[PDB]
């Protein structure tokens, strides 16, 4: 119902409560998984599967 509870005023206060500490850790995970995906899936050495045209989900579900 969103009635009350501890509300940090800014980022620096998220360490003033264990629940908000876990929340900021989770937010860090959420936002930091994106740069990791950028680096991993846009890497120079990444190569498409040579057999990618052998089979695809499009033919399977069709």
């Amino acid at each position: 119902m969103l009635l009350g509870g501890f509300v940090p005023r800014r980022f620096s206060q998220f360490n003033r409560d264990p629940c908000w500490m876990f929340f900021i850790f989770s937010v860090g995970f959420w936002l930091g998984e994106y740069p990791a995906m950028m680096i991993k899936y846009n890497a120079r050495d990444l190569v498409y599967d040579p057999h990618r045209y052998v089979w695809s989900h499009h033919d399977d579900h069709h």
């Binding site: 119902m1 969103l2 009635l3 009350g4």
Partner: protein, 139 residues
């Protein structure tokens, strides 16, 4: 003062609820959050207003203890279970249920394999049951 809870309020502002008259009003004009008398009741304004009572150390003239005759009623019946006993029973039951649900959650979301896997490395593919046995005349 302790950190214990008080009479529950359900997040309702007693100055505007449909049963406001049942809650006594103090000198400051703030209705109590409980049937008791509260001197330091306050109202907080989030998206919705809610009444709050802060416990504090206050001395009240304590009337001397009466005799057991004038307040004890020995009308207990075999089916009767007190609120305290009910609370104890429910606490124990919910403790056991919570442990069981924790085990179930762990097994389901971290150990149980999904059935009918494409590679066949995990989960069962299903099988027939209730097959006839020792009934040659059936065929």
């Amino acid at each position: 003062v302790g950190n214990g809870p008080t009479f529950s309020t359900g997040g309702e502002c007693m100055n505007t609820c449909d049963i406001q008259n049942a809650f006594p009003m103090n000198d400051r004009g703030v209705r109590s959050s409980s049937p008791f008398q509260e001197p330091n009741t306050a109202i907080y304004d989030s998206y919705l207003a809610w009444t709050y009572f802060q416990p504090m150390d206050v001395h009240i003239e304590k009337l001397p203890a009466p005799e057991a005759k004038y307040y004890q009623r020995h009308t207990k019946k075999p089916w009767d279970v007190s609120s305290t006993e009910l609370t104890e029973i429910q606490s124990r039951k919910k403790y056991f249920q919570t442990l069981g649900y924790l085990v179930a959650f762990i097994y389901l979301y971290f150990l149980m394999p999904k059935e009918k896997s494409f590679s066949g490395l995990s989960g069962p593919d299903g099988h027939w049951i209730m097959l006839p046995k020792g009934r040659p005349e059936l065929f």
